């Protein structure tokens, strides 16, 4: 196929109630498998998947320190930025960080990335070559030089290039079942008429995994598509997703229309008609 190991970190400052909230959730594409929540009843790194349960103390301890340490640097970071922007300590701010590495369909390193955002916006990005940074503010420039003089990209590149891919490997192994298993979409059309002379046709894809999916409403051949409302793919809550596309048709013409559904767990594309 093609895989990624990626983490998302968020730190939120809490003026009145002291020490900022720090959350950290990791993913092997589309599947969360760990998370750290300095707020949780257990400020420890915990497994979120079950295939992760088969991991020894060493790991959880180590990852727990990692998260703790980042939460600490992130709290220093949040203060520095409150400074660069000459900001009151009485307001809340968010520092986010996302990083991940990807494998080629051929199994090895492919691309790796890293970014920071502050109050919702891009702040510093590790460049493609993975040897430099692009600031976005001037505040960010200070963070940029600081960064280079420190040589952070060097560290980041190592992690990103080995460590990250090496473990992605190990997680794919330990998640053999779950991870490599695709779940195709149960599918179906529905009719909901609007006026005396037209109705809505809704194509439905339910229970599929992974989440990439494609729904198209084309009429008899030309498959030009007419405005089709596509809700944002969503989670069912069980590990699978749901999605649906709607189009408005003139009663009587409901056959002129066909819905095509694309998804890895399908030996082939599926067509539906009302």
């Amino acid at each position: 196929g093609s895989h990624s190991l990626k983490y998302f970190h968020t730190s939120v400052s809490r003026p009145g109630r002291g020490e900022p909230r720090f959350i950290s959730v990791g993913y092997v594409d589309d599947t969360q498998f760990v998370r750290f929540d300095n707020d949780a009843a257990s400020p420890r790194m915990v497994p979120r998947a079950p295939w992760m349960e088969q991991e020894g103390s060493e790991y959880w301890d180590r990852e727990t320190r990692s998260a703790r340490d980042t939460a600490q640097i992130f709290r220093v970071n949040l203060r520095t930025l409150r400074g660069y922007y000459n900001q009151s300590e009485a307001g809340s701010h968010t520092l986010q960080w996302m990083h991940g590495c990807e494998l080629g369909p051929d199994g090895r390193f492919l691309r790796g990335y890293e970014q920071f955002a502050y109050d919702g916006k891009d702040y510093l990005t590790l460049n493609e070559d993975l040897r430099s940074w692009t600031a976005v503010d001037t505040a960010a420039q200070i963070s940029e030089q600081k960064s280079n003089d420190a040589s952070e990209a060097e560290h980041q590149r190592a992690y990103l290039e080995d460590t990250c891919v090496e473990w992605l490997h190990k997680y794919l192994e330990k998640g053999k079942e779950t991870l490599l298993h695709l779940e195709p979409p149960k599918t179906h059309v529905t009719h909901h008429p609007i006026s005396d002379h037209e109705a809505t046709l809704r194509c439905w894809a339910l229970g599929f995994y992974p989440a990439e999916i494609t729904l198209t409403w084309q009429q008899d051949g030309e498959g030009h598509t007419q405005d089709t409302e596509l809700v944002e793919t969503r989670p069912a809550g069980d590990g699978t997703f749901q999605k649906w596309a709607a189009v408005v048709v003139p009663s009587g013409e409901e056959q002129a229309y066909t819905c095509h559904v694309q998804h890895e767990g399908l030996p082939e594309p599926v067509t539906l008609r009302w």
Binding site: E63, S66, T70, I73, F74, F116, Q156, T163
Partner: peptide, 9 residues
Amino acid sequence: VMAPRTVLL
């Protein structure tokens, strides 16, 4: 694993 060290901004 998450990265061993984070950037100091």
